Amino acid sequence: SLLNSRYKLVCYYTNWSWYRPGIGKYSPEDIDPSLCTHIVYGFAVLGNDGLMTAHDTWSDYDNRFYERVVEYKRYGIKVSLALGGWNDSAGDKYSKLVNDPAARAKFVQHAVAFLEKYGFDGLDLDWEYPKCWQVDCSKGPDSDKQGFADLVHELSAVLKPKGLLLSAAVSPNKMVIDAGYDVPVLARLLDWIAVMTYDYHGQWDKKTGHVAPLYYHPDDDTTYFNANYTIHYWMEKGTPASKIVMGMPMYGQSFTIENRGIHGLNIPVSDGGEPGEYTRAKGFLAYYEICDRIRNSGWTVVKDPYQRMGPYAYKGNQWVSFDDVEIIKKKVNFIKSLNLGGGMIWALDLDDYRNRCGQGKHPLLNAIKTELLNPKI
Numbered sequence: 001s002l003l004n005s006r007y008k009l010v011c012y013y014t015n016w017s018w019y020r021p022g023i024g025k026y027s028p029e030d031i032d033p034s035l036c037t038h039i040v041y042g043f044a045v046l047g048n049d050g051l052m053t054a055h056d057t058w059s060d061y062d063n064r065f066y067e068r069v070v071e072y073k074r075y076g077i078k079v080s081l082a083l084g085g086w087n088d089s090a091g092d093k094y095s096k097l098v099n100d101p102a103a104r105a106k107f108v109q110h111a112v113a114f115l116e117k118y119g120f121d122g123l124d125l126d127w128e129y130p131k132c133w134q135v136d137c138s139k140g141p142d143s144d145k146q147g148f149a150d151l152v153h154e155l156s157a158v159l160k161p162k163g164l165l166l167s168a169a170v171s172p173n174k175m176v177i178d179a180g181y182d183v184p185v186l187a188r189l190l191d192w193i194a195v196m197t198y199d200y201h202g203q204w205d206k207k208t209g210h211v212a213p214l215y216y217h218p219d220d221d222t223t224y225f226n227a228n229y230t231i232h233y234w235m236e237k238g239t240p241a242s243k244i245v246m247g248m249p250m251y252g253q254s255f256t257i258e259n260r261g262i263h264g265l266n267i268p269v270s271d272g273g274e275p276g277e278y279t280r281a282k283g284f285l286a287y288y289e290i291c292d293r294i295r296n297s298g299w300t301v302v303k304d305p306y307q308r309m310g311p312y313a314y315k316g317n318q319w320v321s322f323d324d325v326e327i328i329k330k331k332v333n334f335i336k337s338l339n340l341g342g343g344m345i346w347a348l349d350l351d352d353y354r355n356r357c358g359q360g361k362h363p364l365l366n367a368i369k370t371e372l373l374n375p376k377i
């Protein structure tokens with residue numbers, strides 16, 4: 001059992017995975033409580049009044065999704081509420097919050113009251129990101145860095161005496177870490193730091209690449225866009241290994257390549273991949289969408305034999321990179337070799353939780369659990 005091991009397994013739950021057809025539908029009651037130590041609810045958002053509020057009142061309040069996920073505290077799981085996420089981070093509203101001490105002070109007392117109203121064990125900060133709003137470092141003032149660290153302090157100072165948790169999901173990008181994160185404050189005050197060691201590559205690159213390389217690979221354009229560098233950078237900036245939980249994607253980045261004859265790594269790309277039937281977003285595919293394309297639509301799989309990264313798969317002008325059970329066992333032995341706090345997945349509902357592909361229910365997340373519980377490194 002994961003609850004009696006030295007590792008965390010932090011699972012993100014997403015309230016919008018309810019709005020999916022057929023087998024893609026995911027509800028609170030689909031959470032498998034033997035697969036996580038911590039569940040993080042994505043996402044609450046920052047309202048116009050500068051206070052945390054439900055992103056989707058229909059599901060969160062009227063259909064009691066908050067209460068239905070906080071349910072799993074009954075199995076010994078810690079359930080936190082995440083604030084922010086990519087789409088809530090598009091503007092300046094978090095920056096206006098953290099640069100204003102009176103707004104932070106109001107925000108903080110209300111936030112803790114919100115968490116306790118619904119029974120949450122903690123808060124997860126997912127502002128993407130201080131200074132580099134949606135990764136654009138020219139957007140935010142440098143004082144976002146100190147503002148966010150002061151927010152984290154002011155949150156910790158009220159949460160910690162109550163026994164409540166404070167964590168954050170943070171960029172894997174060297175440039176964002178340098179510009180927006182006061183790493184020693186974060187490392188000292190957070191119960192864990194969920195490093196989002198994925199989305200290194202995607203349609204924005206105008207070229208094919210892997211969503212989540214583990215190690216540097218010789219054809220890479222940078223030495224720093226891989227989990228191994230990102231994890232060592234966080235520790236080098238001052239993070240104790242035990243605070244790091246390493247992010248792993250349950251989904252793939254998809255691309256439309258510019259001609260179907262070329263189909264390897266780093267080949268030109270005109271757009272994101274075609275949207276999946278269930279996730280309905282150009283540019284990505286859930287693992288259960290990918291594994292079905294491979295098993296039944298004849299997509300070809302190319303594994304990396306050096307095992308610096310997971311596979312990619314292509315058909316015609318469609319190309320997707322993703323993690324398979326093999327690279328995940330490698331990532332988890334890596335987690336164990338560095339004595340990291342544990343692993344994190346984005347997200348429960350993107351793994352093959354219905355066993356649509358014949359490898360078992362939740363093949364990726366079971367692979368993580370099994371490797372985390374295996375004593376050999």
Ligand SMILES: CC(=O)N[C@@H]1[C@@H](O)[C@H](O[C@@H]2O[C@H](CO)[C@@H](O[C@@H]3O[C@H](CO)[C@@H](O[C@@H]4O[C@H](CO)[C@@H](O[C@@H]5O[C@H](CO)[C@@H](O[C@@H]6O[C@H](CO)[C@@H](O[C@@H]7O[C@H](CO)[C@@H](O)[C@H](O)[C@H]7NC(C)=O)[C@H](O)[C@H]6NC(C)=O)[C@H](O)[C@H]5NC(C)=O)[C@H](O)[C@H]4NC(C)=O)[C@H](O)[C@H]3NC(C)=O)[C@H](O)[C@H]2NC(C)=O)[C@@H](CO)O[C@H]1O
Pocket residue numbers: 012016019042043055056084085086087088126128134135169170171172173196198199200201202204205225251279280281284346
């Ligand atoms: C260009 C240049 O000059 N420089 C480049 C750099 O750009 C480049 O850096 C890269 O830059 C890209 C951005 O272009 C970054 O990509 C971002 O990476 C982040 C990770 O650090 C991602 O954020 C985290 O992880 C996940 C993704 O894995 C995030 O998930 C996303 O979350 C949002 C919510 O915030 C989800 O949005 C939900 O979307 C669905 C639609 O799909 C909505 O669904 C609808 O719901 C309503 C009701 O609610 C319903 O009625 C509708 O029917 C329904 N519709 C459908 C179709 O279903 C939801 O409502 C909505 N939810 C909310 C709350 O709004 C989104 O789907 C989800 N995506 C996935 C795949 O799950 C999550 O927020 C983050 N948190 C955590 C804990 O994981 C971010 O996703 C990603 N952005 C994009 C655009 O992909 C790269 O990180 C960055 N890389 C690096 C290394 O920095 C660099 C490097 O390449 O190079 C420079 O030079």
Ligand SMILES: *[C@@H]1O[C@H](CO)[C@@H](O)[C@H](O)[C@H]1NC(C)=O
Pocket residue numbers: 215216228229232
């Ligand atoms: C991982 O990173 C560290 C420091 O950046 C480096 O010393 C080590 O050799 C890297 N491992 C691989 C396999 O690239």
